[PDB]
Amino acid sequence: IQKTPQIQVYSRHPPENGKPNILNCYVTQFHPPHIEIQMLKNGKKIPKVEMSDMSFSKDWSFYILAHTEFTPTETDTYACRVKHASMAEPKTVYWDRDM
Amino acid sequence: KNYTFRCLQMSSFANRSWSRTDSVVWLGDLQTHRWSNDSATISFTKPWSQGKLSNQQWEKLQHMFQVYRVSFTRDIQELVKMMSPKEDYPIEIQLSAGCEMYPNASESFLHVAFQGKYVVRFWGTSWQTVPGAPSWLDLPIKVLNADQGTSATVQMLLNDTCPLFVRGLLEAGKSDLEKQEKPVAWLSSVPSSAHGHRQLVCHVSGFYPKPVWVMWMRGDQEQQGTHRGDFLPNADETWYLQATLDVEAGEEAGLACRVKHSSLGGQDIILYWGSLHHILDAQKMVWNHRHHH
Amino acid sequence: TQVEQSPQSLVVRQGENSVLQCNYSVTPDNHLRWFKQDTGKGLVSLTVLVDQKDKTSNGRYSATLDKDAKHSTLHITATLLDDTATYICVVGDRGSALGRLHFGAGTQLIVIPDIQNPDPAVYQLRDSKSSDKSVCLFTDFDSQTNVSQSKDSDVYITDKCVLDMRSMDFKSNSAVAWSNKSDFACANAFNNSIIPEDTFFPSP
Amino acid sequence: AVTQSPRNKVAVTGGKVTLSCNQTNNHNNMYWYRQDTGHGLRLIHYSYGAGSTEKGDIPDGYKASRPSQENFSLILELATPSQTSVYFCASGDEGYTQYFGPGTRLLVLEDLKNVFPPEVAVFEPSEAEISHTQKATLVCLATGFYPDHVELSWWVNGKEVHSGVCTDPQPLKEQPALNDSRYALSSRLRVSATFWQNPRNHFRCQVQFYGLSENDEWTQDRAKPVTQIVSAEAWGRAD
Ligand SMILES: CCCCCCCC/C=C\CCCCCCCCCCCCCC(=O)N[C@H](CO)[C@H](O)/C=C/CCCCCCCCCCCCC
Ligand SMILES: *[C@@H]1O[C@H](CO)[C@@H](O[C@@H]2O[C@H](CO)[C@@H](O[C@@H]3O[C@H](CO)[C@@H](O)[C@H](O)[C@@H]3O)[C@H](O)[C@H]2NC(C)=O)[C@H](O)[C@H]1NC(C)=O
Ligand SMILES: *[C@@H]1O[C@H](CO)[C@@H](O[C@@H]2O[C@H](CO)[C@@H](O[C@@H]3O[C@H](CO)[C@@H](O)[C@H](O)[C@@H]3O)[C@H](O)[C@H]2NC(C)=O)[C@H](O)[C@H]1NC(C)=O
Ligand SMILES: *[C@@H]1O[C@H](CO)[C@@H](O[C@@H]2O[C@H](CO)[C@@H](O)[C@H](O)[C@H]2NC(C)=O)[C@H](O)[C@H]1NC(C)=O
């Protein structure tokens, strides 16, 4: 009945330290459709986070796209945090420029 | 033969009392309507989402879906009382309806999923249960197919009003469906899980439409460990995609990533690994690597 | 409140037609059924309309349905006297068992006979048993005559009833009145009705 | 065919009342309504098959029960005079059509002491109507019964008749003030003067009274007002 959610974290433009950008969190492959998503800078939650409309694919798997303005630096941390029924504790996935 | 229109309804039932139904509507990659449970009215997401219909005809179409949304909620709840206690809440139902359109050619569809498995479609004149669908659905399909009226209107909505509408929609949003956004690429590298290797990563982001080509090249030789990624969306209706290549350490020099896309003419983008350009791009994105995969 | 019939009560003279209206606000409005219900009895269906703009027929009954106005009419051609009943209007919101039915509160049809040669009179009847007990019988009046209830809460007055002696093809109206009091004479036991001038009160 | 049982019931406030309904159509779906002057039928409970019972619009006061495909029961575990009503059953298959039963009249009163059978008298045609119209009207009077679960028939030489007959469609209350008031009904039989003047002609007025059953205990010293038939007789006369 349940499907565990996949999470992908990637920037809109080439990362340049100190240059403003947009960080996307694209959560997929989860069921049931109910889900809480946060995006985090240095462990605190980013408040100005916009979310697309939930949808689903030709194989009935749901998906949703978060994003916020953000500027990458040499040492600040960015992560997407997802709370869903299929997991006992929410899954945190940090943004890795190099992946 | 290349455009597909999808009404994606997703409806959730939690107990005998709590429901919500939210839909979205795509034309290709381009979302074109939204309607959330808490909104009495369908919402346009492009300035041409009314297609080529007048307001008197759109508002009628709207008014029928509003009646439909409220009735489908009671119906599913009544079907759950009919099957009790065999099926019960939580219950999730998904409808996918619309028409792909070939060059005056249409095929139309309406598919239902019960708890994430495709199970029932409308075909020809009636709802029918698909191969491999659970036998217990037989009775519910018997009761919904008793309703000749809804069968008459669904038949109208697929056979005639869907193509009708979507052809207008195709003319109304031509310039957006044909919009050309240039991709841009950058490079990066990661440890391979194989000792001594590296995974090179050609990032590609910002292209519309979706067809694209990304190969790691050594001169004239396409590198055939080149692993293409999944398409990932950007929030501005452009696409994103990476292609990776697992090399042995030291074997990078000479490899280039090449990208072909409609929006370039024939002037392909090419990033040579060792180049001076890459080196400069690379020291603008250095970091402490804390919380890497 | 969501199905509404009109008139609430209708009287007609035998042999004429009568029209009965149903207005509803049910959504969605799949089908409209009309019932006839004799007093005490159940519900005999008469007809059912389903299209968006419909006419049906069963013998002497015919009905329209216009789903745009959400309105139906039931026409009875040449009312017989068997035709007095409540007529009930029912709307079902689905074309299947998932539907709920929505019922009118009914319309009361009263078919009254044409009394050719009214012969109005109030007779006194005596109990067969020697009880000194007595009832007053108002009979053979015209149909347009209404019999009113009681000024005095110790007089009792039925409503007008119509009998038919089929063998003689003759029909008459009547209403019994009685009391247990002392100052009570049939001559003025229907005080409170509109009584024809030529009404025959036989003196005792 | 859809059948109900019982078809007239007198219950006392507080008692448990079971209304059965039986259907031999093999319909999965059955329904219970009540009808009350002022509204149409209002749905109480329904059922999509054996083992299922589901609330309708006005379920408070009732439990339902569906042990078999063919039987559907409305339980009143705590009878209220609000639940005095006519109760109709119905069944149906997957289609939109429901097939209604004949109804059940239930009265819930405070004390079964208020139940009274009718007294019956037959009143003989006046000479004045005879000499004047050449017709002759017998009047039947049913007095002082509670409740008004009655059928009045007319019997001449031992066969029911309907020609010349006319019965009041609703009873009339004897003391309109009281809520527990006893009813009276009246009926007419009209024959030709020569039919009445024949002394070999027998007229009987007959009242069916629906009242208590044997399961109901009877404490009072007046005769237990069980369901029964009261009558009154008159013989033609030639003078
Ligand atoms: C058809 C598309 C062409 C129109 C183009 C413009 C689109 C504008 C956009 C958006 C809003 C879309 C909202 C969701 C899309 C729904 C499309 C199909 C709707 C079907 C219309 C039926 C007409 C109607 O009125 N039906 C009735 C209401 O009176 C009736 O209740 C509806 C019955 C539908 C039931 C279909 C579900 C079948 C599978 C259920 C089986 C599993 C349940 C088992 C639970 C125990
Ligand atoms: C998803 O949407 C449906 C419908 O939009 C929501 O159900 C509806 O919720 C409203 C809010 O209470 C109900 O309104 C009620 O109306 C009566 C009318 O007399 C009024 O007396 C009440 O005070 C109340 O305002 C409405 O009846 C109800 N159902 C329908 C068919 O509209 C539902 O709650 C939504 N789900 C979520 C999770 O938000
Ligand atoms: C809308 O288009 C659909 C096709 O997707 C039409 O479905 C076809 O409808 C016809 C009659 O309406 C069906 O023909 C029947 O076939 C059966 C045996 O298959 C036969 O017993 C009948 O006497 C009749 O010949 C046909 O099966 C059905 N096609 C499919 C694939 O199911 C539909 O009728 C169209 N409706 C409108 C309003 O245009
Ligand atoms: C039925 O299920 C819904 C679905 O969760 C319940 O709704 C929750 O209600 C509480 C407060 O009552 C909220 O704090 C939650 O956020 C709600 N859930 C969601 C997903 O929004 C509802 O309480 C349930 N009701 C019954 C009677 O079972």
Angle at Cα C120 formed by Cα C117 and Cα C124, nearest 5°? 140
Q: How close, in Å, is residue D161 to chain B by CA atoms?
A: 48
Residue found under tokens 């078809």: D7
Both C3 and C95 in one domain: the answer is: yes
B209 prior amide bond cis, ω within 30: yes
What is the number of domains present in chain B? Answer: 2
Both B211 and B174 in one domain: the answer is: no
The CA–CA distances, whole Å, from D81 to B177, C39, C76, D10, D78 equal 70, 22, 38, 11, 10
CATH code, D73: 2.60.40.10
Technique of determination = X-ray
Residues C202 and D128: beta-carbon distance below 8 Å: yes
How many angstroms separate the CA atoms of D3 and D7, rounded? 9
CATH code, A18: 2.60.40.10
**Torsion angle (degrees, nearest 10) of CA B123, B126, B131, B133:** 130
Find chain D residues with C-beta within 8 A of C101's C-beta: 41, 43, 98
Helix (H, G, I), strand (E, B) or coil at B236: coil
Residue B290 lies in a domain: no
Both C94 and C132 in one domain: the answer is: no
Both B169 and B189 in one domain: the answer is: no
Residues D146 and D211: beta-carbon distance below 8 Å: no
Residues D96 and D207: beta-carbon distance below 8 Å: no
Both C16 and C90 in one domain: the answer is: yes
Residues B110 and B158: beta-carbon distance below 8 Å: yes
Residues D154 and D165: beta-carbon distance below 8 Å: yes
Both D68 and D130 in one domain: the answer is: no
Domain boundary among D91, D110, D129: D110
E-assigned strand segments in D66-104: 73-76, 85-92, 99-100
Find chain B residues with C-beta within 8 A of A86's C-beta: none
Cα D51 from chain centre? 32
Both B135 and B15 in one domain: the answer is: yes
Both D85 and D32 in one domain: the answer is: yes
C186-192: which pairs have CB atoms within 8 A and are 24 or more residues apart?
Answer: C186/C122, C186/C123, C186/C124, C186/C136, C186/C137, C187/C122, C189/C122, C189/C136, C189/C155, C189/C157, C190/C122, C190/C136, C190/C138, C190/C147, C190/C148, C190/C157, C191/C151, C192/C148, C192/C149, C192/C150, C192/C151
Domain boundary among B178, B201, B223: B178
Both C47 and C77 in one domain: the answer is: yes
CA-wise closest residue to D118 among D12, D203, D206: D206
How many angstroms separate the CA atoms of C11 and B92, rounded? 56
Crossing angle of the two packed helices B148-156 and B138-146, in degrees rounded to 10: 80
Residue B196 lies in a domain: yes
Both C98 and C124 in one domain: the answer is: no
Residue B27 lies in a domain: yes
Both C24 and C81 in one domain: the answer is: yes
B199-213: b (≥16 Cβ within 10 Å) or e: bbbbbbbbbbbeebe
Q: Is B109 buried (19+), middle (13-18) or exposed (0-12) by CB count in 10 A?
A: middle
Interchain proximity D170–C159, CB inside 8 Å: yes
Both B18 and B147 in one domain: the answer is: yes
CATH code, C118: 2.60.40.10
CATH code, B187: 2.60.40.10
Which tokens in the block code for residue B170? Answer: 């195709």
Residue B197 lies in a domain: yes
Domain boundary among C82, C113, C144: C113
Both D71 and D139 in one domain: the answer is: no
Residues B11 and B35: beta-carbon distance below 8 Å: no
Q: What letter would DSSP give residue D84?
A: -
Residue found under tokens 């008159």: D234
Residues D204 and D155: beta-carbon distance below 8 Å: yes
Residues with CB under 6 A from ligand 1: B 7, 9, 23, 25, 33, 35, 42, 65, 67-68, 71-72, 75-76, 79-80, 83, 87, 93, 95, 97-98, 112, 114, 120, 127, 140, 144, 150, 153-154, 157, 161-162, 165; C 28
DSSP string, C80-116: -GGG-SEEEEEEESSSSTT--EEE---EEEEEE---S
Domain span at residue B211 reads 179-275
Both C101 and C154 in one domain: the answer is: no
- Dihedral sign, CA of B10, B13, B14, B18? positive
Domain span at residue D137 reads 111-238
Residues D70 and D22: beta-carbon distance below 8 Å: yes
Interchain proximity B78–C27, CB inside 8 Å: no
Domain boundary among B146, B178, B210: B178
Domain boundary among D81, D110, D139: D110
Angle at Cα D27 formed by Cα D24 and Cα D30, nearest 5°? 100
Domain boundary among B159, B178, B197: B178
Residue B18 lies in a domain: yes
Phi and psi at C186, nearest 5°, equal -60, -25
Find chain C residues with C-beta within 8 A of D188's C-beta: 137, 161, 163, 174, 176
D163-180: b (≥16 Cβ within 10 Å) or e: ebbbbbeebbbbeeeeee
What is the number of domains present in chain C? Answer: 2
Helix (H, G, I), strand (E, B) or coil at A31: strand
Helix (H, G, I), strand (E, B) or coil at A26: strand
What is the number of domains present in chain A? Answer: 1
Both C1 and C101 in one domain: the answer is: yes
Q: How close, in Å, is residue B284 to chain A by CA atoms?
A: 5
Amino acid at B214: V
Domain boundary among C113, C140, C158: C113
Domain boundary among D46, D78, D110: D110
Domain span at residue C24 reads 1-113
Both C82 and C145 in one domain: the answer is: no
Both C77 and C64 in one domain: the answer is: yes
Both B190 and B219 in one domain: the answer is: yes
Both B255 and B146 in one domain: the answer is: no
Residues C41 and C123: beta-carbon distance below 8 Å: no
Which tokens in the block code for residue D186? Answer: 């009246």
How many angstroms separate the CA atoms of A13 and B223, rounded? 26
Strands C9-13 and C107-112: parallel
Both D79 and D38 in one domain: the answer is: yes
What is the number of domains present in chain D? Answer: 2
How many angstroms separate the CA atoms of C195 and C188, rounded? 10
How many angstroms separate the CA atoms of C81 and C27, rounded? 36
